[PDB]
Structure formats: structure tokens, C-alpha cells
Design a protein around this nucleic acid. Structure first.
Lengths: 229, 1134, 162, 54
DNA sequence: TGAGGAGTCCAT
DNA sequence: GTGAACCTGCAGGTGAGGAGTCCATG
DNA sequence: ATGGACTCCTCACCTGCAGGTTCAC
DNA sequence: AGGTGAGGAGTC
């Protein structure tokens, strides 16, 4: 892939504004004039609008603080399942987690009944009948929330730890916990009632190239204070 | 040059004068040298010496006659390399030599000579020239080797007549051995290698007593020597030890009056070799065992004092399997903790192997000196004459043949003399009781890998640096040589681009001569006489140029008027991508802006631009642009211009440098030249002859007197950029570059520009693979960098101008990155040039800058370094004192430190021997710190940065009330034990004030109060040393009695298994024992504690250990006579 | 090393017309060949075995003809007696034809003079000091031992009487 | 036996490696040239009558 | 007193 | 009276960024 | 030798401080 | 097997 930026006003220069995807568009309208005169013109449309809500930065920050508070009162375990063990991925990830007042631990085998973040390898490498660590340690423990990551994504281009990945992993953990307990933990807004949610789901079989083949559809709804799946 | 060559001539005459006075004796001649770094300079200096001998007049009449001149010119010789030496001798000389030694019968020599001569006859094009050089070298080697062997002991052909002339032409170094000549001209690289005579190769660095050395460009040589020290060879440390251990068990020397006192020097080495065999099971091979250990090699780095770095993740271990019959390197338990290693360590093996290997190469030199002593005067049975330079190879081959060790011949030859030439200097010991410094210790790098072919064994390669360039320069002075170094920046304050003059002011002393203030003012007066600007009207104009983008924007548009934008023109028609755009804009703007000012001014003709990169064909696209601009600005004003691109060192010696002068004194116009900082460092004399018909009126002379010869002028406009990469790098190989980088890091840590924390981090990232850019970033945060930049600016302006004829307007344009650095100059402007003062003054007039003196930073860093070394060395010493057998050197070293601290707790001047025990504090008598003495040494902080920490001073040892006892004071006064702290700026480090001073202070106070009332003291029988203080005997008492001390009310958490283990070990061999635990300087009001074998206090009578609270109270230093009486009662019939 | 030495020889080959550059070139080429092939061999000695295919295969089969026997392209060789007693190089090592003779056909022409040629090869052999060798062997055999592994089975018992 | 990384399995392949192993475990390595120059001509002796002195 | 000269490979 | 939140819209971004040379080795 | 339509692929983001206003006690 | 969106390459 090769791409060109949309707009650029760096240092208020008119030469850099001429080399974008909205600078060429200005030239295009100046070439239809010098070959056709005013015979042909192109006019654009403005969508009507009266309700436009700018979002500040403080509201997002305060949202994420309360996001992490709920995750604080739980147990978090990190495990490593690579074949040729190397790198301090567990230590680095634990450092990143503990910078947010969330305290976790390191285990050699996953624990049952606690949130687990696992470190695994590339999926293609393991053989077909090889018992993938992830698949095995999932199917046996069927009442436990899981997460996984590759060890290469915790280091940036220059070698420093990547914070962003840590925040993403924690937020996703909370989302699955919310699904498992069937009751919301943080304050979401309210939505239309007496409605049912349906989602089609494509089969994961490689033979599922049929266009019209029927798909399973899954349904969710809310009764009382409990979601039903 | 005039002064130096005159200095040479005066000595040439003094030797003649001495020769005519002294038959009443007989001695040798004095050797005089003239060394530099370039071949051209050597040749030119020789030519000037001969010219001075010819054209020198006194009272308007020659000082010498024609016949006298020949004698003087017959004593100067020039020594080139071998390849050039062969290509000057003609066919007649070589044919005569070959016939004289009967080498024409052989087939190989004649065939080789035919090829050499045949190529010589058709050497016109630069294709057979390259081959001719390489073949000439090899032929020279073989011919000289055979000549030497034929002259060795027999069939020595007698040299006289034409044969002598032929040989001396082919071998100039012969003319010195017989005594014909005593003046030599040679380069630095050839001076460190030596030259050839008939007998053997002569090494100038092995005999320097009574020799005068003239070195030009003294500061540059620091680099040259370094490049020679990084080209050494590696060595396997397993093969060496197994080859030394096997050959030092049965082989013996001879009992003759020529081998006296040589068999007593190899005995300790023989003793240590066997111990290193039994401890590590050197009868088996080595191999690794485990994953992640067979994938990558293992690298270890040691500084031999305190800095150690490893390339692994967890500590590695060594084992010995008696069933598989092999030694295995295993990673052991990689989890956190879990039974810390009790098998062995790889690091210990490497470090101990090195000491033995260098212990064998230092004993041989001593042996050879002793051999010469016995063979010159105690035998004199066959006359051989000659000195230690002659009995060099015989004394080596004799010992090597006797000991069946013939593979170490080369390694002995590289570093050998009476003692050293590539091995340490100064104190010659790594211990607290010796002077320690980096410049005579070096560094070690070790790699472990698989052997070639075999898939079951591993080897350990090692590379070493044994001496810094400064140490070599100092040893030359201590040998007895006189060194005269001439330069303009010979005393800069840089340690990377110049020697370390602080190390040379502590080791040399009063042998480092210096000029006085009166002499400096005399030189200043001379300089102002020959160059006077406060008359005739000469002015210097300075301007600083910033970056201008609007200036370049319009110019690019005019260059290609049919384009659209500026970035597109720069990217497309010129050849730079988007990454390299800001930097390009930056320099080009300033360059063109300076050129405009040059062209506008009427009375200027010549301009030189100094950049950091070559403007050659590779940058053709940019060149055209610049050219175009000039033409436009030539039409705006009224003057014609000419430009010269591609000025390289290759261009200088292929096209020449005399064309600019021709174009200047034959045609009118202006000239612009493009050059770099390094290119205009090997091409000198940038002068052009003048012609007043072409020039105008601005050639005012500045000399107070008239000037001779032709009329010449110089540069009148200069552009200065800011220098580029200033960190040294090698190109010989990979290991050479690594050694270079480690050398520089350790040098900066030595002087005081870097803290131990930063230095260790930098070393670690060097080991794991590092980019150049990060290294330069680390370099730029030090004060050495600014000194280097200033040095280059000074040199650049100094070389621009060599005549007494100047214009009335001299223009200097400077980049806008040098302003702050130049404003920071604070030295004495007594011997400065004229342009440099203008630069400094112009920069200094803008605002003001807070200056944090380098001294203040240096004190903090050096305090940290000394404190860091103390801890590690003490731990190593005590651990070596807990081995089952205790040695004798160790107990001596243990005694000396305490005795020295007690006698001199605070010195005044700079200590020389015990140097890493004293730190310099800003206040005089006390200092405050805060840290932990059982954790990370790189966490300490001192002085004002910690105003609430612990204090090191005289009041915290209670020495006032310590010596106020009546039975303690006489003992202190007799043995010269100071009872006060002289207020000077040297106190002991916080490691030697809590674990050394405190103990030894109270321990000997025990030996006064106990000894006055009977009791007798003794010494530990070499088996329980440092586990107990002393042994006491009184009135014939059985069950030998041991004691121990803890100075004041100091408590230690060893009441657990440690104390019980001590008691158990003592009693298991010596039998029943009694123990006296006592303190001092405490509260003498507590009862006596009679502890049993454990800490379950039993009845008074059935006890084994007595604990006394105190004997001398801190109130007014009384004596607890009740405690002494009870102690006598318990240790009696009972 | 390689670029400088190769540039020298490459330049000198062009002017190879006079009967003086011939003598120098003949000796220089022999030295260059040894170093180049030695570097090739140690590069492919295990470790990073660079594969050969297409252009590279053809070039290496032009510089090392003895390689064509190893892979299985050719099985008929023409050579002289002196080169037969020493061997020819392949990409991996030096192949001595006097160690694998099982089968094979050897046509020798002028069988009488071969006697003299072989004798010459026997005479040009280096000497050996005896005192040094005996002392070395005596010292190193006193305590050194091999490994105890299946690949080293019944080898130690061959050295006991010595 | 001893399945491992396999290649041409004959005298040629095992020669150099065996010599280096046996000459690394016993120290030595100063005899490499002699052993290499004797395994070509003299290497075909010990035939119980073709090479025996008694 | 005894006999009487050229011709060759290959790695250093 | 004041000092904690609270609320726009102008800057600046990984490090820093190259020639030139002596001598021995088959 | 041609054109315009679905499906699968890769790549970037996830600011920061300084100056004027304002309550909250 | 971080995520959600916005978007450039390879073919019936």
C-alpha cells in the first residue's frame, strides 16, 4: 500500500497544501475553467445539520478512570506458554499493568476461576494435529474468561514498551467479564425497550463459500436486570 | 622549522667538539630523531636541513668551508618502508650483493628477481605499479632473511670496499650499527615497528637512554598509537592452560653458572598451575547442555577493577560429570531464587585463567634480564660484546627449548624487553596498597563458541588492551628520553582528541617543564612585531548566519520556472527524499547567503568555504544549482567570478593546487573554492603570488620592518560551518572497533565527565548491539565535546594566512550553531591569534550565560567512583581470606590498610600509593552522605544534594573520649596513631569509615586495658583467620582462649546459625575453647551475660562464652575494674 | 583483502602481451585462487550453507569443475599423475581419489615412466624432530581422557598399550 | 545407528570430523598436518603380510 | 683413475 | 481573598546526519 | 487486446503545555 | 491470536 495524506497546514505553507488530496481537487476545478470556460461546472452538496456535539478531553479521561476502578476489585494472572521461552514479556506486561494501580501476578499454569491473560505464539506455526496451547487450555476450563497476545506486540519500533496495548487488553477483559456475569458493572445509558437483538453469524468452515446458504442467528434481550442470551 | 633545525645543528656541532677533546677513553654516539605522521613532511624537513647547512653565513661570509659541509651531510639518513627501499637501488648494487653472498646458485631467488626487474622495466601505467609494490615487499623480506642467516655465527663474509657501499645503500640501518651516522628521519608508524640491520631487527623503543626526540603535531599522535594497539591477536584460554599445566610438572632447567637465579622465578607459577588443575578438573573437555545456549554465542566484558558486563539473561554455571567424563556449562535454575548456585561460575574461570596467562609472559622478561647479567660479566669465556639489545633471541630460545614450549614464541616476541613495552606501567599492581589507574590496567573481552568441525567441544577466545597511549608516552620519559612537542593546541582540555595531562602531572612530577609568564610576554611581543594591525588600517568583520527558508524558496522557483511548488522541485529535479529535507534546507540557505555577501563587496577576490562533506559528482544535481545562482549574482553587480568544485586530496595530488594562484595573478575576477575540514589539513601553503598591475590599492603591509623574497598574499574571506561526528572509529576489523569504543567510555569515566551509572548503561548497550547515532547522543551531553569543537575552529583560522601582506577588509562568516559554545570560552587570551579573539568577543556580547564550573561536577562523580571501587575490592579480599588455606600476601594487605588509616586519617596533599581511599570534599574536615552499604553501589549521593543524611566527621567516632583513658593514650601516642583530625580537603570514603576504621579502632583498645592487668596476646594460626580477633594466654591456662570485638554498642544479627557454626567449627578441630565477647565505649552499668553454646543463657559457672557490656564508659572514660575482676574469676579454677 | 587483490590481477590481465607480465601473472593467480576457495569452503562448512541454483550453480561449476562429480552430473575424469596423487577441490573439502577405489577403472598410458614420477612425489616430504614429538606425546597422554558416549564406543581400548 | 542430522555417510564425510574430535579431546592439534599427509599413501597398510615386520 | 646431459610436473 | 478546577487553540515531533592514511604480511 | 463490478489484504491512532477566567470556601 | 474504521491490490 501507498497513501497520501488528506490535508496539511504545517507551518502555514502554501507549497505543502498543494500536495494533498484536497489540494489537487482545487487544481481540478481550475482546469475545467481554462479548457471549457463556464460551459461546464460541478457543484457540491451540503448536508443540513442543527445538532452537533463537540467532545472534550476531560470527559474521556474521567470515563476511563471509573473503567479501571471496577477492574481493580478482582484477580489478574499472567502466564507464558511459548515453546522456546525468551524475553521478559510477563515482567514487562506486569509493569505496564501495575502502573495503573492494578495489581496482578505471574503463574506457570493457568488458574481456574480467575481472569487470565496468556502469551502464545503464531497460530500458523503449530501443526494441525498439534494441540494448540490456547485451544487445549480453553476447552478443559469452561467457566473462565481468557485473553491472549503475541510477545512481539509489547515492544515498539525503538524498543520502548507500548502503553496503548496494555490499556486495550484491560478494557477487553472487562467487556468479557460483563458478558459472563449477565449484569452491567459500569453506567451505560438507556435504550429503546421491548426490542430483541439478532445477529447473523458466518460459518467458520472453509467450505462456507455458498452465498445463499442459511446462517445461524443469535438473539439477546434484557428482562428485569438480567440479559438473556 | 627554522628554530627546530637550528636546535638540531647545535647538537651536531657539540658532538664534534666533544670528540676532539676526549684516546683518553672510548664511548658511543648520541642518536637524534625527527618523527611525524606524514611522509611528505619528513622529506621536506630533511631538505631544509641540508639547505640550512649550505646557506648559512656569519658576518657576511660563510660559516663553513666546502670540505667541512660534506662531513655534516654524511651523517643524516632517511628510513622509508621496505617496498620503497627496494625500488631505489639499481641493478648494479643488487647484482653485486647477490654475487657477494653466493645467492645466484639458488633457483627461487633468481626467478623472483627476474619477475621484479621485468615489471620494473615497463612501469608507466598505474596497473603494473600496484602489482610492483606488493611483489617488492615479499622479495625484500626473503632476501634479507637469507642474508641475516648467512651472517649469524659462521661463514661471515668480510665487508669492505664496494661491497660496503652496496650493502649500505640497500640497508641504511647498517650505517648506525657501525657508527657512520647518528641522525635519523622517520615516521611514527615505522618508529613503533623498527628497522633492519645485518644481524637482526632493531627496536628503537628498547633503548632510549640519552636520546633527543622532536615530535611535530604532538596532539594528533594519540590517535596513531591507539590504532596500532588494536591490531593484536586473540588466544584460546583453555588450550593455553592445559598446555602450561602439562609442561610444568617434570621439565627442569640446567645447573650452570650462566643460569643463576632463574629457576627460583618459575616456582610459584608451578605451584598455582596444579591448584587450577584440581579445582576445575582440567582433564576433561568443555561443552554446553541446554536450550537457548546452543543458539547464540556468549560474550563477557571485564575491566579488571569493578566494571563487569555479561550478555546472558541468567547466571551460568559449571559442573563436572564423572560418568559422562565431561564438564558441562548449564543454565541451572532459571526461576527467581530456588537454591542459588553452589556449583561454580563461568566468570571465575575466565578471570582466573587471565591472571595466570599474563603471569607467564611477565616472568620471562625478568629471566632474560637476569640471563644478560650473568652472561656479560660472570662467564666472559667466548667474547661476544653487545648489550641487552644483542642478547635478545638467544636468551629466549634457550629457555623455550628447555621447557618444551615453542608455541609461545610469537606472543613473547610481540611484547618483550627488559620489562614490558606492552604491559602496564606506574604502580604495576591492582591493589589498595598501590597506585591504580586505567592507563596501565586495560580491559578484557571474551567470547565462547563451538570449535571448527567438532560438534561436542567449545572454546574461549580473548582479546586484551594492556596500556593506553598516555602510559606509553610516560614510560618513554621514565626510560631517559627527552621529548620536545611543538604545536599550537598542545594543551587542550580534551581526553579523546588529546592526551590526559592530569595523569601526566601526577606520574611525571617536576619532569614536565613549562614556560613562565615573562617568556610568554616576550613571545607575544615578537608576534605583534611581525603582525601589527593597530596601524596601517586592518579591520576584521564577523557575521553569524541563521537559516532562511523564504530566501531559498524563490530561488528554486526561478531555477525551474515551469513547475508548481518548491518541495516538488527539490524532490524531483534534485535528488533528496522526504526524510532528508529539513537538514538540506538548513545548510544550503546559509551557504548561498554567505556567497551573496562575498560577491557584493568590491575589494575582495579570494574566498574559501569549509564544509563537512565533499561536493563531488555524487552531488552533481546540487552543484549546478549553486553554479546557476553565482551567474545571476554576477550580473546584478559588475564583477566576473570563477568556482572550483571537487577539491579532494586525490584531486590535489592528481591535478595540483598551483592553478588558483596562476588564475589569480594572470586574470582579474573572483574565485570561490569548496573544501572540507580534513581535506585542507594535508594540503598546505594556500598562497598566491601577487601582481600589483591586477590588484588595486588594498595591500597594506603590516610588518614593522621590510620583508624579503617575492611578494605573496593569502585568503581574505572565510565561511565556517559546524563540525560533524567527533567520536573515533576504526576500520581494520570488528574487534578493533569494539576495543576502540570501550577505551573511550572508560577514559571519560576516568577523568570525571561520566557517572558510574551512565557508564555501565552505555557499556551494556554497546554489548547488545548499538547504532552510531545513539553513541553520538550520549557523547553530546559532556563537556569534552565543546572543547573539541573549539580546537577545530582555532586550527581552521590559524592556518589561513602565512604572509605579512593583508587587505584592509577581512570577512568572517560563521554558522549560527557555534555562538553559545564560543561564548563559553574563559581561558587567558595571551597567545591567541587575531581572528579568534574577534570571534570570541563578538559572541560574548549577547545576553549572559550561567556557567556551572566543570570542577563542581567532577568532584561528585569522582567521589562516587572511589566509593564504588572500595566495596567490591573489600568483598573480594575477605572472600579470598575465607578459603580453607590462607595465603601470606593477603594478611599483609589486610594489616597495611588499617595501619595506614590509623596513622593518616586525613592527608593534605594528593595521596600517591593509597589513592582510592581518600575523597576530596568541598568543606575541609567533614562531609554528609546518604545511602546503603549492603545494596546497589550506584545509588549514593553526597554533599549539598543531601543536606539531611548521615555525617562523616571527627565527632562521630568519639575519638576525643576514646583516648581520654589512662591505659589507652600512651599506646596511641607511641605508635604514631593520630588522636585528632587535621582539617584538610581529603577524608576517608564512607566504605572505609564504618567497616574498617571502627573495628580496628576498638580492637586495639581491647589490647591496652586487658594487657595492663596481666593477659598476653598472640596471632591466629592461619586456619580461623577473620573468624576471630586474637588469642589470649595468661598464667598457664588450658583450653586455648579466643576473643572478638564489636567496638561500641554495635549489634549484628548473627545470633542465628552463624555464631553456632563458628563455635562448632572451632571446637571440632582445636577441641574445647573459651570465648571472650567484650565491647567498649558503652554503658558500664549492666550485668554480665554468660551465654552457653547456644543463646539460651545458663548459670554463670556452666558457661562457655562471656559477654561484657563495656569496660571504658563514655561519660569520662573510666575503667570497669569489676568486670575485669569477674573475667579473671570466670577464667580461673572455677 | 579480496577486492584489492582481485582488482590488481584484473587490471594486469588486460596488458598480458609482453613476455614479462606473463611470469608475474602466473604466480599471482595461484595465490589468489587458494584464499578464495578457502573462504568459500569455510562459509559453507555447516552454519549458513548458501544454496546453489541457476546462475550461481553454473558459475561455481565453472570455477570448481570437481564439484560436478559430487552431485552426480559427470563420472569420467581426465587428469595427470601428479594431480591424481594430490587431489582436486570441491565446494566442501579436498577429495583424494586414493581413499575410494572400490570398483572404478584406471587406464594408465606409458606405465614404465610412472615409477620415476611417483618416486619424486615420495621424496618431497617434510622432516620431523623426534625428541620434541616424544616429549609432547608423553606429556599430553598422562592424564587426558575421552568421553563416554555411544559414538565413542570401543575407541579408548585401542589406545591402552600405547 | 544414532539417528541425527544426516548427509553423505561414508569415509569422506566422517574423516575430518573424527580426526578433529580425537585431536581435540587429547589436546595435541600440533600433529594435524602429519595425520593428514599419512592417511593417503601409508593408509592402506596392515594387511598381515602386506605390512608386518617379524 | 673414475666419467662426461636434457626434460618435467604443482603448490606455495 | 485565594487557590483548586475549568476552558480554548498555537507548536512541534528518536537519536543525528564523513574524509583520509602507514606498514606488514606468500 | 478491454471496463467496471464484489471479495480479501495492509496500515495508522490512541497530543501537550501556556495564558486568561472562575468559582468554592 | 490487541481493537474499530478507512482504504489500496489482485481477478471473474
Amino acid at each position: 500500500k501507498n497513501r497520501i495524506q488528506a490535508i496539511d497546514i504545517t507551518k502555514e505553507s502554501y507549497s505543502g497544501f498543494q500536495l494533498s488530496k484536497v489540494g489537487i481537487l482545487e487544481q481540478f476545478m481550475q482546469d475545467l475553467k481554462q479548457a471549457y470556460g463556464d460551459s461546464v461546472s460541478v457543484k457540491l452538496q451540503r448536508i443540513p445539520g442543527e445538532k452537533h456535539r463537540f467532545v472534550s478531553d476531560t470527559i474521556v479521561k474521567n470515563h476511563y478512570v471509573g473503567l479501571f476502578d471496577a477492574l481493580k476489585e478482582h484477580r489478574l494472572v499472567i502466564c507464558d506458554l511459548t515453546e522456546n521461552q525468551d524475553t521478559d514479556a510477563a515482567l514487562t506486561l506486569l509493569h505496564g499493568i501495575e502502573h495503573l494501580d492494578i495489581n496482578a501476578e505471574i503463574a506457570e499454569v493457568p488458574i481456574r476461576g480467575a481472569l487470565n491473560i496468556l502469551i502464545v505464539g503464531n497460530k500458523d506455526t503449530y501443526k494441525s494435529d498439534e494441540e494448540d496451547p490456547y485451544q487445549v487450555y480453553r476447552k478443559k476450563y469452561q467457566d473462565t474468561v481468557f485473553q491472549s497476545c503475541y510477545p512481539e506486540r509489547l515492544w515498539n519500533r525503538q524498543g520502548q514498551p507500548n502503553r496503548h496495548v496494555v490499556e486495550v487488553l484491560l478494557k477487553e477483559l472487562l467487556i468479557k467479564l460483563e458478558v459472563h456475569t449477565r449484569k452491567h458493572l459500569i453506567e451505560y445509558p438507556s435504550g429503546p425497550e421491548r426490542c430483541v437483538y439478532y445477529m447473523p453469524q458466518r460459518p467458520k468452515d472453509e467450505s462456507s463459500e455458498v452465498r445463499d446458504e442459511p446462517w445461524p442467528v443469535y438473539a439477546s434481550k434484557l428482562v428485569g436486570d438480567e440479559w438473556q442470551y | 622549522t627554522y628554530t627546530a633545525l637550528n636546535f638540531l645543528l647545535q647538537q651536531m656541532l657539540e658532538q664534534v667538539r666533544s670528540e676532539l677533546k676526549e684516546n683518553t677513553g672510548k664511548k658511543s654516539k648520541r642518536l637524534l630523531y625527527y618523527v611525524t605522521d606524514s611522509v611528505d613532511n619528513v622529506v621536506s624537513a630533511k631538505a631544509d636541513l641540508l639547505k640550512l647547512i649550505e646557506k648559512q653565513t656569519v658576518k657576511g661570509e660563510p660559516r663553513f668551508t666546502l670540505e667541512q659541509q660534506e662531513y655534516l651531510k654524511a651523517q643524516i639518513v632517511h628510513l622509508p618502508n621496505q617496498s620503497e627501499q627496494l625500488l631505489q637501488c639499481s641493478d648494479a648494487v643488487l647484482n653485486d650483493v647477490l654475487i657477494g653472498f653466493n645467492l645466484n646458485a639458488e633457483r627461487d631467488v633468481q626467478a623472483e628477481w627476474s619477475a621484479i626487474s621485468g615489471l620494473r622495466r615497463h612501469a608507466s601505467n598505474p596497473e603494473v605499479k600496484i602489482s610492483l609494490n606488493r611483489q617488492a615487499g615479499y622479495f625484500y623480506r626473503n632476501l634479507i632473511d637469507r642474508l641475516q642467516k648467512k651472517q649469524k655465527g659462521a661463514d661471515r663474509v668480510l665487508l669492505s670496499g664496494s661491497l660496503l657501499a652496496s650493502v649500505e645503500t640497500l640497508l641504511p640501518g647498517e650505517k648506525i650499527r657501525n657508527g657512520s651516522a647518528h641522525v635519523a628521519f622517520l615516521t611514527t608508524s615505522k618508529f613503533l615497528k623498527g628497522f633492519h640491520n645485518t644481524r637482526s631487527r632493531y627496536s628503537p623503543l628498547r633503548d632510549l637512554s640519552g636520546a633527543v626526540l622532536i615530535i611535530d603535531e604532538i596532539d594528533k599522535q594519540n590517535q596513531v598509537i591507539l590504532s596500532e594497539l588494536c591490531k593484536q591477536q586473540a588466544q584460546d584460554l583453555i588450550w593455553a592452560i592445559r598446555t602450561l599445566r602439562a609442561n610444568f610438572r617434570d621439565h627442569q632447567l640446567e645447573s650452570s653458572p650462566r643460569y643463576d637465579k632463574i629457576e627460583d622465578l618459575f616456582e610459584p607459577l608451578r605451584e598455582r598451575l596444579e591448584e587450577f588443575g584440581t579445582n576445575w578438573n582440567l582433564a576433561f573437555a568443555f561443552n554446553t547442555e541446554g536450550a537457548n545456549l546452543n543458539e547464540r554465542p556468549v560474550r563477557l566484558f571485564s575491566d579488571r577493577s569493578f566494571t563487569h558486563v555479561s550478555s546472558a539473561t541468567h547466571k551460568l554455571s559449571l559442573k563436572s560429570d564423572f560418568l559422562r567424563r565431561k564438564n558441562l556449562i548449564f543454565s541451572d535454575e532459571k526461576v527467581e531464587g530456588s537454591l542459588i548456585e553452589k556449583h561454580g561460575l563461568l566468570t571465575r574461570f575466565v578471570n582466573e585463567a587471565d591472571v595466570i596467562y599474563q603471569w607467564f609472559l611477565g616472568t620471562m622478561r625478568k629471566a632474560v634480564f637476569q640471563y644478560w647479567e650473568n652472561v656479560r660479566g660472570l662467564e666472559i669465556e667466548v667474547r661476544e660484546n653487545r648489550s641487552l639489545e644483542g642478547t635478545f633471541q638467544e636468551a629466549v630460545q634457550s629457555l623455550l627449548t628447555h621447557f618444551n614450549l615453542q608455541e609461545f614464541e610469537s606472543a613473547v616476541y610481540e611484547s618483550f624487553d627488559t620489562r614490558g613495552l606492552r604491559q602496564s606501567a606506574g604502580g604495576k599492581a591492582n591493589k589498595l596498597s598501590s597506585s591504580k589507574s586505567y592507563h596501565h590496567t586495560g580491559l578484557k573481552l571474551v567470547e565462547v563458541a563451538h570449535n571448527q568441525g567438532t560438534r561436542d567441544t567449545v572454546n574461549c577466545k580473548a582479546s586484551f588492551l594492556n596500556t593506553s597511549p598516555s602510559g606509553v608516552l610516560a614510560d618513554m620519559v621514565d626510560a631517559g628520553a627527552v621529548i620536545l612537542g611543538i604545536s599550537a593546541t598542545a594543551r587542550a582540555d580534551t581526553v579523546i582528541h588529546n592526551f590526559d595531562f592530569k595523569y601526566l602531572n601526577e606520574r611525571l612530577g617536576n619532569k614536565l617543564l613549562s614556560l613562565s609568564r615573562e617568556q610568554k610576554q616576550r613571545v607575544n611581543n615578537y608576534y605583534h612585531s611581525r603582525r601589527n594591525y593597530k596601524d596601517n588600517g586592518v579591520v576584521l568583520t564577523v557575521k553569524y548566519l541563521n537559516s532562511r527558508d523564504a530566501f531559498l524558496d524563490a530561488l528554486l522557483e526561478e531555477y525551474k520556472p515551469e513547475a508548481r511548488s518548491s518541495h516538488f522541485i527539490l524532490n524531483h529535479y534534485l535528488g533528496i527524499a522526504e526524510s532528508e529535507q529539513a537538514f538540506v534546507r538548513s545548510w544550503l540557505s546559509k551557504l548561498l547567503a554567505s556567497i551573496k555577501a562575498f560577491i557584493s563587496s568590491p575589494d575582495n577576490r579570494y574566498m574559501l568555504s569549509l564544509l563537512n562533506r565533499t561536493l563531488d559528482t555524487t552531488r552533481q544535481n546540487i552543484n549546478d544549482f549553486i553554479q546557476f545562482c553565482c551567474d545571476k549574482w554576477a550580473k546584478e553587480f559588475n564583477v566576473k567570478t570563477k568556482t572550483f568544485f571537487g577539491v579532494n586530496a586525490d584531486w590535489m595530488r592528481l591535478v595540483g593546487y598551483d592553478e588558483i594562484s596562476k588564475h589569480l595573478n594572470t586574470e582579474l575576477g573572483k574565485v570561490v573554492v569548496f573544501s572540507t575540514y580534513a581535506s585542507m589539513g594535508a594540503g598546505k601553503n594556500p598562497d598566491y603570488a601577487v601582481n600589483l598591475a591586477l590588484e588595486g590599492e588594498s595591500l597594506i603591509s603590516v610588518a614593522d620592518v621590510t620583508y624579503s623574497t617575492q611578494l605573496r598574499s593569502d585568503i581574505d574571506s572565510i565561511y565556517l560551518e559546524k563540525p560533524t561526528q567527533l567520536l573515533l572509529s576504526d576500520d581494520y576489523s570488528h574487534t578493533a572497533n569494539q576495543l576502540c569504543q570501550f577505551h573511550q567510555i572508560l577514559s571519560l569515566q576516568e577523568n570525571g565527565e561520566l557517572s558510574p551509572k551512565s557508564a555501565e548503561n552505555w557499556c551494556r548497550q554497546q554489548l547488545m548491539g548499538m547504532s552510531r547515532e545513539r553513541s553520538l547522543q550520549q557523547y553530546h551531553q559532556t563537556s569534552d565535546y565543546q572543547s573539541a569543537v573549539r580546537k577545530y575552529i582555532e586550527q581552521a583560522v590559524g592556518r589561513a594566512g602565512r604572509t605579512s601582506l593583508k587587505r584592509k577588509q577581512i570577512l568572517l562568516f560563521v554558522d549560527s550553531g557555534l555562538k553559545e559554545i564560543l561564548a563559553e570560552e574563559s581561558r587567558d587570551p595571551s597567545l591567541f591569534s587575531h581572528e579568534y579573539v574577534a570571534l570570541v568577543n563578538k559572541a560574548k556580547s549577547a545576553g549572559k550565560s550561567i556557567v556551572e564550573d566543570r570542577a563542581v561536577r567532577r568532584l561528585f562523580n569522582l567521589a562516587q567512583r572511589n566509593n564504588k571501587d572500595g566495596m567490591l575490592s573489600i568483598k573480594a579480599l575477605v572472600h579470598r581470606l575465607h578459603n580453607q588455606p590462607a595465603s601470606k600476601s593477603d594478611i599483609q594487605e589486610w594489616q597495611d590498610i588499617r595501619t595506614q588509616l590509623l596513622r593518616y586519617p586525613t592527608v593534605a596533599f594528593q595521596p600517591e600509593r593509597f589513592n582510592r581511599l581518600y575523597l576530596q570534599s568541598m568543606t575541609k574536615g567533614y562531609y554528609r552522605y546518604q545511602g546503603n552499604l549492603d545494596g546497589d553501589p550506584n545509588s549514593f549521593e553526597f554533599f549539598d544534594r543531601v543536606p539531611y543524611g548521615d555525617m562523616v566527621s571527627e565527632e562521630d567516632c568519639s575519638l576525643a573520649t576514646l583516648v581520654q583513658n589512662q591505659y589507652v593514650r600512651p599506646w596511641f601516642e607511641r605508635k604514631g596513631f593520630a588522636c585528632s583530625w587535621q582539617k584538610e580537603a581529603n577524608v576517608m570514603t564512607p566504605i572505609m569509615f564504618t567497616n574498617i576504621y571502627k573495628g580496628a579502632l576498638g580492637e586495639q583498645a581491647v589490647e591496652a586495658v586487658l594487657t595492663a592487668f596481666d593477659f598476653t596476646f598472640e596471632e591466629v594460626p592461619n586456619s580461623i583467620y577473620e573468624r576471630f580477633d586474637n588469642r589470649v594466654i595468661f598464667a598457664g591456662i588450658e583450653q586455648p582462649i579466643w576473643l572478638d570485638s564489636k567496638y561500641w554498642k554495635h549489634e549484628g544479627n548473627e545470633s542465628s546459625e552463624g555464631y553456632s557454626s563458628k563455635i562448632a567449627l572451632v571446637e571440632e578441630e582445636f577441641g574445647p575453647s573459651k570465648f571472650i565477647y567484650v565491647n567498649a565505649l558503652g554503658d558500664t552499668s549492666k550485668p554480665i551475660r554468660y551465654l552457653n553454646s547456644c543463646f539460651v543463657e545458663t548459670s554463670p559457672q556452666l558457661a562457655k562464652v562471656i559477654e561484657i557490656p563495656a569496660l571504658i564508659d563514655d561519660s569520662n572514660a573510666d575503667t570497669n575494674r569489676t568486670a575485669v575482676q569477674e573475667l579473671i574469676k570466670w577464667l580461673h579454677h572455677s
